Amino acid sequence: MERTFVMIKPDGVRRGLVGEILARFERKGFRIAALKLMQISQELAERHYAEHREKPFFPGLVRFITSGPVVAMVLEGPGVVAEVRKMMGATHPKDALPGTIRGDFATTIDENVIHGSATLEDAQREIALFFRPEELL
Amino acid sequence: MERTFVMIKPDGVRRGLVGEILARFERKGFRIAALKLMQISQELAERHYAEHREKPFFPGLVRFITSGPVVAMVLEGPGVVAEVRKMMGATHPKDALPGTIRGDFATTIDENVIHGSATLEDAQREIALFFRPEELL
Amino acid sequence: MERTFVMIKPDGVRRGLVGEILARFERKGFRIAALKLMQISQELAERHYAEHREKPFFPGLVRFITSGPVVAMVLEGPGVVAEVRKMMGATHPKDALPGTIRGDFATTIDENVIHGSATLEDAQREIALFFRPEELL
Amino acid sequence: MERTFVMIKPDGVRRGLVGEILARFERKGFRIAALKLMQISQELAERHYAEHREKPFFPGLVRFITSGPVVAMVLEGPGVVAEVRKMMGATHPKDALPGTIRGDFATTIDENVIHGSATLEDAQREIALFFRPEELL
Amino acid sequence: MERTFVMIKPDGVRRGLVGEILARFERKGFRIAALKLMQISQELAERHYAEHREKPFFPGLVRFITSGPVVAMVLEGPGVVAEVRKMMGATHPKDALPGTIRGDFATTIDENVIHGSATLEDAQREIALFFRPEELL
Amino acid sequence: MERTFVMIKPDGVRRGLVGEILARFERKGFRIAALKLMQISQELAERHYAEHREKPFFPGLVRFITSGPVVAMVLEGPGVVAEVRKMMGATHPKDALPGTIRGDFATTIDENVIHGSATLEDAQREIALFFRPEELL
Ligand SMILES: Nc1ncnc2c1ncn2[C@@H]1O[C@H](COP(=O)(O)OP(=O)(O)OP(=O)(O)O)[C@@H](O)[C@H]1O
Ligand SMILES: Nc1ncnc2c1ncn2[C@@H]1O[C@H](COP(=O)(O)OP(=O)(O)OP(=O)(O)O)[C@@H](O)[C@H]1O
Ligand SMILES: Nc1ncnc2c1ncn2[C@@H]1O[C@H](COP(=O)(O)OP(=O)(O)OP(=O)(O)O)[C@@H](O)[C@H]1O
Ligand SMILES: Nc1ncnc2c1ncn2[C@@H]1O[C@H](COP(=O)(O)OP(=O)(O)O)[C@@H](O)[C@H]1O
Ligand SMILES: Nc1ncnc2c1ncn2[C@@H]1O[C@H](COP(=O)(O)OP(=O)(O)O)[C@@H](O)[C@H]1O
Ligand SMILES: Nc1ncnc2c1ncn2[C@@H]1O[C@H](COP(=O)(O)OP(=O)(O)O)[C@@H](O)[C@H]1O
Ligand SMILES: [Mg+2]
Ligand SMILES: [Mg+2]
Ligand SMILES: [Mg+2]
């Protein structure tokens, strides 16, 4: 029942890591409730990162997240939000532990391969923001 | 430039083979131009099967193809249509060689895990049928 | 010389995770001293979980562990007991770290894919309880 | 329904290929109906080779097949006997195609890592010889 | 005893396929007798291509083979020369079967990821040309 | 720009773990700036472990590191020194976490599969000690 939003960022897609990452989630046992390759519009990127609109890395952040196609998805399963968060590893790749997605695939904070909803509330919000209602199965 | 349509069938999705299959296409070097989880409707299924209509197993097929969500995609690359047919292996798993998708993942023709356009024309037809134009990137 | 008992539970077997899990142990360098697919009898399950006989989840626990075939084994190698315990990860999948067996394959405490002897004493006891003496090589 | 007998030979076991090989059969979709680590006795080995008896390498074979523990198993699935012969590849590794077990893991016919029943009848014969009835699940 | 020369081309190195390719040769059972990252010089490249000289694409080839670092190696094992040609698959990826290196990793003959000695004599010639004697172990 | 020295020890090479380990680094995104199979000379081993020259395990240590060929390399990338150190895991395999190289492949401190420069200074020193200047690309 519980759902979380996940996004394989432009770098992850360009480096051909989509299947590998998705396999980790299926292997874990989560259900794919939604999935799609998509181009983040300038607007979506600004809404999504509104939180950091004042920050100084905001411009470069928006430029990165829209630099290429991303793979958006919604994973379903018991405590999927917290578990997916643990699977991704620390935001700053330098602190992400091995066995973790960022720990195994990312090297810098700027291009950290993936995003996972931080909380239940963030998830509900991100899902409505990235997917159309009928796209959830 | 050349592109093909691929569909991971309901059996492939429920068995959690989506990532593994996508990974093979990515390691091969093909570009993912479109991708999405979707539910095939009765009408849609029947439209896709226009020649296999006056055939027999037609109903039993539609039943399976609509039995659950499928993962649709478009792959791009040199001779990708013929190349993907080769990667999938024979339609009937028993005749598909080890190393191919159906050879390594399927056991019956009923649930042969995946579908790939037979020709460039079939691909164009399938792409227009399963994807909206804006979903192609 | 040191040995530990490991069991891939009914869920792990049903989800086709036996080879993958066994590969992690061979890759680690441990020796397979015993191995067998088996059905846990009502009696064995009760003996094995005697510790939690009074608990409330006992009935459902016994029902799960006997719900289907399991793969029992004995691994041999330096500090194998403690190392195998670390490899499995926390009992409650929610706390199991990525790279860990439960961390990568389990989502709930009820069906946590695998068991590993907790101590040397538990190992000796579990081994005699699950395997016949001549089955150890 | 249909079933076959498979044996990971002593070389396959010592090289730690048990999990990887089992994983291929599991991802393929076959059911594991029996499995066990065992030591083949002199008599047992000779009984298994009844026609190859008046042959030459007979002794050198028995020597190898009894040189260490083997992993015996029974696999179930549609046309599993022929399908497994295809998955193993040619008896002599040099003629086994990449993607098959012997093609990817073996280099000599002497130690060709695995054995699989040649026919349904050979399978029944091998199953009755290597497994007790109660070991079949 | 028998040995062959293998070169992971510039495209294979930049795409980060070195480990995956080496892993296949190791799981196969071949011994690595020599290995090194190197930059092929103009002269060196041309010397390697002595017969393909009066040919056409010669310059376009040298351009690619010297376009970046390559990983050179010598593999040892029974019939390793023919065996490695089989593992690499057809020179042109479109004709290479799934399961082979070029079949699973390449799409164009221009950048077909890897090279392997065609004969024992070519191997000796290539080994003397790319490796100093002391680099053979 | 930053570089670190890594060495797959004799055990790792003998167990055929080179490709697998190298793949983890390419997957991570680091660049291979140098690579070569080599035999550590008595002198090099003594220089490298001069730090522990007084210790009691020194003799056995030198004997191990020179017991067979090793694969030496230099990895390049952002904070590669610290990240590679984290990827390898604790020196004593017993304390190395799963998902970590030693955590997944090593069982004892004596034969712990791999080495990674501890600091920037150690790296510069190890690189000049193991590789010739022209071998860095
Ligand atoms: N006995 C059968 N039982 C169930 N489905 C069958 C049977 N025979 C054929 N099919 C179905 O028929 C279709 C086969 O298509 P066709 O023979 O025209 O070429 P194809 O390359 O296999 O196409 P596809 O990729 O869709 O399988 C598939 O959708 C398959 O599942
Ligand atoms: N030159 C040889 N050296 C060592 N063993 C050999 C040699 N030739 C054949 N063998 C052995 O002979 C047997 C070959 O069996 P056979 O040719 O009847 O069919 P098969 O399908 O290969 O059977 P199997 O699965 O047991 O290998 C194997 O056990 C194999 O190891
Ligand atoms: N159209 C082409 N474009 C670019 N390179 C080509 C083309 N045709 C052939 N080549 C190059 O020609 C060489 C083919 O060698 P050859 O046909 O003699 O046998 P081979 O077994 O393929 O050798 P190799 O392992 O070096 O590819 C390769 O180096 C390949 O990249
Ligand atoms: N130093 C930094 N440079 C660039 N981007 C940063 C930096 N610090 C944080 N960010 C960005 O802000 C966001 C942090 O939010 P959080 O959801 O906790 O992490 P993440 O998005 O990496 O999962 C990410 O989009 C991240 O890239
Ligand atoms: N909340 C719970 N629900 C179901 N089973 C539980 C619960 N808490 C503990 N258990 C069961 O009790 C046992 C705990 O013993 P332990 O050996 O430390 O862990 P595990 O068996 O998971 O390795 C397991 O069989 C586990 O499934
Ligand atoms: N108890 C021990 N037995 C054998 N060798 C040891 C022991 N303790 C330390 N060493 C050796 O000393 C070195 C420790 O240095 P360090 O660079 O921190 O670890 P490592 O080389 O394992 O990465 C290694 O070469 C290690 O094998
Ligand atoms: Mg098809
Ligand atoms: Mg056989
Ligand atoms: Mg070649």
mmCIF file with all atom_site columns, C-alpha atoms in Angstrom, chain E residues 17-137:
data_model
loop_
_atom_site.group_PDB
_atom_site.id
_atom_site.type_symbol
_atom_site.label_atom_id
_atom_site.label_alt_id
_atom_site.label_comp_id
_atom_site.label_asym_id
_atom_site.label_entity_id
_atom_site.label_seq_id
_atom_site.pdbx_PDB_ins_code
_atom_site.Cartn_x
_atom_site.Cartn_y
_atom_site.Cartn_z
_atom_site.occupancy
_atom_site.B_iso_or_equiv
_atom_site.pdbx_formal_charge
_atom_site.auth_seq_id
_atom_site.auth_comp_id
_atom_site.auth_asym_id
_atom_site.auth_atom_id
_atom_site.pdbx_PDB_model_num
ATOM 1   C CA . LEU E 1 17  ? 33.762 -2.912  -19.591 1.00 0.00 ? 17  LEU E CA 1
ATOM 2   C CA . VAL E 1 18  ? 37.269 -4.039  -18.605 1.00 0.00 ? 18  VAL E CA 1
ATOM 3   C CA . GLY E 1 19  ? 36.308 -5.823  -15.384 1.00 0.00 ? 19  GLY E CA 1
ATOM 4   C CA . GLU E 1 20  ? 33.198 -7.503  -16.820 1.00 0.00 ? 20  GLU E CA 1
ATOM 5   C CA . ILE E 1 21  ? 35.196 -8.849  -19.760 1.00 0.00 ? 21  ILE E CA 1
ATOM 6   C CA . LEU E 1 22  ? 38.106 -10.058 -17.620 1.00 0.00 ? 22  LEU E CA 1
ATOM 7   C CA . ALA E 1 23  ? 35.584 -11.687 -15.265 1.00 0.00 ? 23  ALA E CA 1
ATOM 8   C CA . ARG E 1 24  ? 34.253 -13.808 -18.139 1.00 0.00 ? 24  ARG E CA 1
ATOM 9   C CA . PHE E 1 25  ? 37.734 -15.121 -18.903 1.00 0.00 ? 25  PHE E CA 1
ATOM 10  C CA . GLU E 1 26  ? 38.367 -15.830 -15.221 1.00 0.00 ? 26  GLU E CA 1
ATOM 11  C CA . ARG E 1 27  ? 35.079 -17.642 -14.627 1.00 0.00 ? 27  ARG E CA 1
ATOM 12  C CA . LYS E 1 28  ? 35.848 -19.627 -17.789 1.00 0.00 ? 28  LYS E CA 1
ATOM 13  C CA . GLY E 1 29  ? 39.026 -20.855 -16.113 1.00 0.00 ? 29  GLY E CA 1
ATOM 14  C CA . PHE E 1 30  ? 41.719 -19.215 -18.225 1.00 0.00 ? 30  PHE E CA 1
ATOM 15  C CA . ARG E 1 31  ? 44.906 -17.965 -16.577 1.00 0.00 ? 31  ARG E CA 1
ATOM 16  C CA . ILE E 1 32  ? 45.960 -14.332 -16.967 1.00 0.00 ? 32  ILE E CA 1
ATOM 17  C CA . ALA E 1 33  ? 49.636 -14.503 -17.967 1.00 0.00 ? 33  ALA E CA 1
ATOM 18  C CA . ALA E 1 34  ? 50.052 -10.805 -18.789 1.00 0.00 ? 34  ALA E CA 1
ATOM 19  C CA . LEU E 1 35  ? 47.967 -7.632  -18.447 1.00 0.00 ? 35  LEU E CA 1
ATOM 20  C CA . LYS E 1 36  ? 48.462 -3.897  -18.817 1.00 0.00 ? 36  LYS E CA 1
ATOM 21  C CA . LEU E 1 37  ? 46.829 -0.600  -19.656 1.00 0.00 ? 37  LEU E CA 1
ATOM 22  C CA . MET E 1 38  ? 48.718 1.023   -22.523 1.00 0.00 ? 38  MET E CA 1
ATOM 23  C CA . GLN E 1 39  ? 48.613 3.715   -25.177 1.00 0.00 ? 39  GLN E CA 1
ATOM 24  C CA . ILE E 1 40  ? 49.249 2.450   -28.699 1.00 0.00 ? 40  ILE E CA 1
ATOM 25  C CA . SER E 1 41  ? 51.542 4.751   -30.677 1.00 0.00 ? 41  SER E CA 1
ATOM 26  C CA . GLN E 1 42  ? 51.077 5.579   -34.354 1.00 0.00 ? 42  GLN E CA 1
ATOM 27  C CA . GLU E 1 43  ? 54.024 3.430   -35.416 1.00 0.00 ? 43  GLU E CA 1
ATOM 28  C CA . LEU E 1 44  ? 52.950 0.566   -33.160 1.00 0.00 ? 44  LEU E CA 1
ATOM 29  C CA . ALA E 1 45  ? 49.403 0.608   -34.534 1.00 0.00 ? 45  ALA E CA 1
ATOM 30  C CA . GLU E 1 46  ? 50.631 0.501   -38.139 1.00 0.00 ? 46  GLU E CA 1
ATOM 31  C CA . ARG E 1 47  ? 53.087 -2.319  -37.432 1.00 0.00 ? 47  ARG E CA 1
ATOM 32  C CA . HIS E 1 48  ? 50.250 -4.359  -35.927 1.00 0.00 ? 48  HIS E CA 1
ATOM 33  C CA . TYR E 1 49  ? 48.315 -3.868  -39.169 1.00 0.00 ? 49  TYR E CA 1
ATOM 34  C CA . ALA E 1 50  ? 50.798 -5.022  -41.824 1.00 0.00 ? 50  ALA E CA 1
ATOM 35  C CA . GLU E 1 51  ? 48.471 -6.804  -44.267 1.00 0.00 ? 51  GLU E CA 1
ATOM 36  C CA . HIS E 1 52  ? 45.508 -4.470  -43.742 1.00 0.00 ? 52  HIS E CA 1
ATOM 37  C CA . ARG E 1 53  ? 47.924 -1.756  -44.913 1.00 0.00 ? 53  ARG E CA 1
ATOM 38  C CA . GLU E 1 54  ? 47.076 -1.447  -48.620 1.00 0.00 ? 54  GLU E CA 1
ATOM 39  C CA . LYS E 1 55  ? 43.437 -1.689  -47.514 1.00 0.00 ? 55  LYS E CA 1
ATOM 40  C CA . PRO E 1 56  ? 41.040 1.278   -47.047 1.00 0.00 ? 56  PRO E CA 1
ATOM 41  C CA . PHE E 1 57  ? 39.673 1.897   -43.521 1.00 0.00 ? 57  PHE E CA 1
ATOM 42  C CA . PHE E 1 58  ? 43.272 1.420   -42.379 1.00 0.00 ? 58  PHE E CA 1
ATOM 43  C CA . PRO E 1 59  ? 43.619 5.094   -41.309 1.00 0.00 ? 59  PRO E CA 1
ATOM 44  C CA . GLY E 1 60  ? 40.187 5.220   -39.695 1.00 0.00 ? 60  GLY E CA 1
ATOM 45  C CA . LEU E 1 61  ? 41.132 2.098   -37.751 1.00 0.00 ? 61  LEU E CA 1
ATOM 46  C CA . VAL E 1 62  ? 44.504 3.377   -36.520 1.00 0.00 ? 62  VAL E CA 1
ATOM 47  C CA . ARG E 1 63  ? 42.677 6.547   -35.501 1.00 0.00 ? 63  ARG E CA 1
ATOM 48  C CA . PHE E 1 64  ? 40.337 4.533   -33.280 1.00 0.00 ? 64  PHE E CA 1
ATOM 49  C CA . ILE E 1 65  ? 42.853 2.053   -31.892 1.00 0.00 ? 65  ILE E CA 1
ATOM 50  C CA . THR E 1 66  ? 45.044 4.975   -30.808 1.00 0.00 ? 66  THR E CA 1
ATOM 51  C CA . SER E 1 67  ? 42.109 7.159   -29.745 1.00 0.00 ? 67  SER E CA 1
ATOM 52  C CA . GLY E 1 68  ? 42.626 6.197   -26.111 1.00 0.00 ? 68  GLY E CA 1
ATOM 53  C CA . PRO E 1 69  ? 44.169 3.648   -23.699 1.00 0.00 ? 69  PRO E CA 1
ATOM 54  C CA . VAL E 1 70  ? 43.672 -0.057  -24.379 1.00 0.00 ? 70  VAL E CA 1
ATOM 55  C CA . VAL E 1 71  ? 43.947 -3.047  -22.074 1.00 0.00 ? 71  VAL E CA 1
ATOM 56  C CA . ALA E 1 72  ? 46.279 -5.725  -23.420 1.00 0.00 ? 72  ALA E CA 1
ATOM 57  C CA . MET E 1 73  ? 46.520 -9.230  -22.039 1.00 0.00 ? 73  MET E CA 1
ATOM 58  C CA . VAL E 1 74  ? 47.636 -12.798 -22.623 1.00 0.00 ? 74  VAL E CA 1
ATOM 59  C CA . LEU E 1 75  ? 45.356 -15.660 -21.614 1.00 0.00 ? 75  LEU E CA 1
ATOM 60  C CA . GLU E 1 76  ? 46.432 -19.264 -21.103 1.00 0.00 ? 76  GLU E CA 1
ATOM 61  C CA . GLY E 1 77  ? 44.475 -22.481 -21.303 1.00 0.00 ? 77  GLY E CA 1
ATOM 62  C CA . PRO E 1 78  ? 43.471 -25.544 -23.386 1.00 0.00 ? 78  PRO E CA 1
ATOM 63  C CA . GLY E 1 79  ? 42.720 -24.448 -26.955 1.00 0.00 ? 79  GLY E CA 1
ATOM 64  C CA . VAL E 1 80  ? 42.482 -20.896 -25.628 1.00 0.00 ? 80  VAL E CA 1
ATOM 65  C CA . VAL E 1 81  ? 43.032 -19.293 -29.053 1.00 0.00 ? 81  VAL E CA 1
ATOM 66  C CA . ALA E 1 82  ? 39.980 -20.890 -30.707 1.00 0.00 ? 82  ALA E CA 1
ATOM 67  C CA . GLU E 1 83  ? 38.038 -20.772 -27.441 1.00 0.00 ? 83  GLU E CA 1
ATOM 68  C CA . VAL E 1 84  ? 38.525 -17.014 -27.085 1.00 0.00 ? 84  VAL E CA 1
ATOM 69  C CA . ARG E 1 85  ? 37.523 -16.370 -30.710 1.00 0.00 ? 85  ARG E CA 1
ATOM 70  C CA . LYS E 1 86  ? 34.316 -18.245 -29.859 1.00 0.00 ? 86  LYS E CA 1
ATOM 71  C CA . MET E 1 87  ? 33.794 -16.221 -26.683 1.00 0.00 ? 87  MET E CA 1
ATOM 72  C CA . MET E 1 88  ? 34.218 -12.918 -28.515 1.00 0.00 ? 88  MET E CA 1
ATOM 73  C CA . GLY E 1 89  ? 31.741 -13.774 -31.245 1.00 0.00 ? 89  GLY E CA 1
ATOM 74  C CA . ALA E 1 90  ? 31.656 -12.551 -34.842 1.00 0.00 ? 90  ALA E CA 1
ATOM 75  C CA . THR E 1 91  ? 33.803 -9.549  -35.742 1.00 0.00 ? 91  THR E CA 1
ATOM 76  C CA . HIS E 1 92  ? 30.685 -7.629  -36.774 1.00 0.00 ? 92  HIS E CA 1
ATOM 77  C CA . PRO E 1 93  ? 28.403 -7.309  -33.704 1.00 0.00 ? 93  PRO E CA 1
ATOM 78  C CA . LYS E 1 94  ? 25.278 -7.847  -35.804 1.00 0.00 ? 94  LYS E CA 1
ATOM 79  C CA . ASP E 1 95  ? 26.432 -11.400 -36.538 1.00 0.00 ? 95  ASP E CA 1
ATOM 80  C CA . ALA E 1 96  ? 27.766 -12.125 -33.051 1.00 0.00 ? 96  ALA E CA 1
ATOM 81  C CA . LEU E 1 97  ? 25.475 -14.332 -30.991 1.00 0.00 ? 97  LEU E CA 1
ATOM 82  C CA . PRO E 1 98  ? 24.022 -13.353 -27.607 1.00 0.00 ? 98  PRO E CA 1
ATOM 83  C CA . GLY E 1 99  ? 26.279 -14.731 -24.882 1.00 0.00 ? 99  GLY E CA 1
ATOM 84  C CA . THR E 1 100 ? 29.457 -13.698 -26.706 1.00 0.00 ? 100 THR E CA 1
ATOM 85  C CA . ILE E 1 101 ? 31.332 -10.508 -25.765 1.00 0.00 ? 101 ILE E CA 1
ATOM 86  C CA . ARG E 1 102 ? 30.582 -8.603  -28.971 1.00 0.00 ? 102 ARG E CA 1
ATOM 87  C CA . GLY E 1 103 ? 27.061 -10.043 -29.031 1.00 0.00 ? 103 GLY E CA 1
ATOM 88  C CA . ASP E 1 104 ? 26.308 -8.685  -25.558 1.00 0.00 ? 104 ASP E CA 1
ATOM 89  C CA . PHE E 1 105 ? 28.386 -5.464  -25.544 1.00 0.00 ? 105 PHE E CA 1
ATOM 90  C CA . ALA E 1 106 ? 28.845 -4.108  -29.104 1.00 0.00 ? 106 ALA E CA 1
ATOM 91  C CA . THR E 1 107 ? 26.677 -2.665  -31.887 1.00 0.00 ? 107 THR E CA 1
ATOM 92  C CA . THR E 1 108 ? 29.114 -1.625  -34.648 1.00 0.00 ? 108 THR E CA 1
ATOM 93  C CA . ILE E 1 109 ? 32.127 -3.210  -36.303 1.00 0.00 ? 109 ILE E CA 1
ATOM 94  C CA . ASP E 1 110 ? 33.897 0.176   -36.046 1.00 0.00 ? 110 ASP E CA 1
ATOM 95  C CA . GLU E 1 111 ? 33.875 -0.091  -32.265 1.00 0.00 ? 111 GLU E CA 1
ATOM 96  C CA . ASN E 1 112 ? 33.529 -3.807  -31.617 1.00 0.00 ? 112 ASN E CA 1
ATOM 97  C CA . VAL E 1 113 ? 34.997 -3.575  -28.108 1.00 0.00 ? 113 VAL E CA 1
ATOM 98  C CA . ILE E 1 114 ? 37.568 -6.356  -28.313 1.00 0.00 ? 114 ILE E CA 1
ATOM 99  C CA . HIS E 1 115 ? 40.234 -8.140  -30.347 1.00 0.00 ? 115 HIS E CA 1
ATOM 100 C CA . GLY E 1 116 ? 41.553 -11.691 -29.980 1.00 0.00 ? 116 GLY E CA 1
ATOM 101 C CA . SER E 1 117 ? 44.363 -13.486 -31.888 1.00 0.00 ? 117 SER E CA 1
ATOM 102 C CA . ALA E 1 118 ? 43.090 -15.341 -34.948 1.00 0.00 ? 118 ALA E CA 1
ATOM 103 C CA . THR E 1 119 ? 45.721 -18.105 -34.757 1.00 0.00 ? 119 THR E CA 1
ATOM 104 C CA . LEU E 1 120 ? 48.521 -19.314 -32.491 1.00 0.00 ? 120 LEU E CA 1
ATOM 105 C CA . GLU E 1 121 ? 51.009 -17.638 -34.846 1.00 0.00 ? 121 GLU E CA 1
ATOM 106 C CA . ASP E 1 122 ? 49.151 -14.323 -34.814 1.00 0.00 ? 122 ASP E CA 1
ATOM 107 C CA . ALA E 1 123 ? 49.135 -14.591 -31.021 1.00 0.00 ? 123 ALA E CA 1
ATOM 108 C CA . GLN E 1 124 ? 52.901 -15.088 -30.777 1.00 0.00 ? 124 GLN E CA 1
ATOM 109 C CA . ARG E 1 125 ? 53.380 -12.170 -33.158 1.00 0.00 ? 125 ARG E CA 1
ATOM 110 C CA . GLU E 1 126 ? 50.990 -9.930  -31.197 1.00 0.00 ? 126 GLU E CA 1
ATOM 111 C CA . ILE E 1 127 ? 52.480 -10.905 -27.830 1.00 0.00 ? 127 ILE E CA 1
ATOM 112 C CA . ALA E 1 128 ? 56.028 -10.066 -28.966 1.00 0.00 ? 128 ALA E CA 1
ATOM 113 C CA . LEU E 1 129 ? 54.739 -6.768  -30.336 1.00 0.00 ? 129 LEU E CA 1
ATOM 114 C CA . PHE E 1 130 ? 52.659 -5.501  -27.403 1.00 0.00 ? 130 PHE E CA 1
ATOM 115 C CA . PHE E 1 131 ? 54.497 -7.014  -24.431 1.00 0.00 ? 131 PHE E CA 1
ATOM 116 C CA . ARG E 1 132 ? 58.125 -7.038  -23.313 1.00 0.00 ? 132 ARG E CA 1
ATOM 117 C CA . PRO E 1 133 ? 59.300 -10.563 -22.371 1.00 0.00 ? 133 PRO E CA 1
ATOM 118 C CA . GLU E 1 134 ? 59.512 -9.734  -18.645 1.00 0.00 ? 134 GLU E CA 1
ATOM 119 C CA . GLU E 1 135 ? 55.828 -8.773  -18.635 1.00 0.00 ? 135 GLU E CA 1
ATOM 120 C CA . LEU E 1 136 ? 54.837 -12.416 -19.261 1.00 0.00 ? 136 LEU E CA 1
ATOM 121 C CA . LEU E 1 137 ? 54.227 -14.378 -16.051 1.00 0.00 ? 137 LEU E CA 1
#
